[PDB]
């Protein structure tokens, strides 16, 4: 299994600021098959980023993902108040899909 | 484009449930479909995958031999047959369209809650 380790577990920041979230894989993620999801309380996950750096339709430019091999990062250049949620990373690059533990952004 | 789960509810350990996911707004038969669950207050955990028919299927180690995924393309419907439920299975179950290189899990249903509980006694 490809273990996805996310840090920090929790971050507290102010509106306007930059959130930098890490997702480290225990092994190279083939084809950059790595996605990010936003999840607000009571709601279903929402795709933000796939293929490491591809922004999903309707996702604001302030969200951008990057990285390759084992080190990935989601950057929210300037936080809006609605941006506060849990963020999961996800590798679809083998036959046992796995997720990170999530990062809560306050 | 939309998925709608159903079939969740409260059951006691050892019981069984069959969940349903009704797809619309896309060519169902050409999508791989997955179930992903979330225990209350916990992270996302992938449960099961099916291909176009395929019939190739894949299961997380925790549900192997108890759960069975299937699809009926003529009904635009994905299914999860949950046998031998245990407390640890308690979670919201989401169905998702897996678009791979074309979007990962780009479409999610609203989820359906499965609670497996004897009610606290008999521990």
Author numbering:
A (entry chain K): 124 to 229
B (entry chain L): 1 to 123
List sentences from the manuscript.
In monospecific diabodies, two identical VH-VL protein chains form a homo dimer. We determined the structures of three monospecific and three bispecific diabodies by substituting the arginine at position 83 with other amino acids. Note that the diabodies we used had substantial sequential diversity in their C”D and EF loops. The second Fv domains of all the diabodies are clustered in a small area, demonstrating that substitution of the positively charged arginine greatly reduces the structural diversity of diabodies. In conclusion, we have found that substitution of the positively charged arginine in the EF loop greatly reduces the ambiguity in predicting diabody structure.
Diabodies are among the smallest of these bispecific antibodies. They are constructed by connecting heavy-chain variable fragments (VH) and light-chain variable fragments (VL) with short “GGGGS” peptide linkers. Therefore, the two VH-linker-VL chains associate to form a dimer with two antigen binding sites, each consisting of the VH and VL fragments from the different chains. In order to investigate the structural flexibility of the Fv interfaces of diabodies, we have determined the crystal structures of 10 mono- and bi-specific diabodies with and without bound antigens.
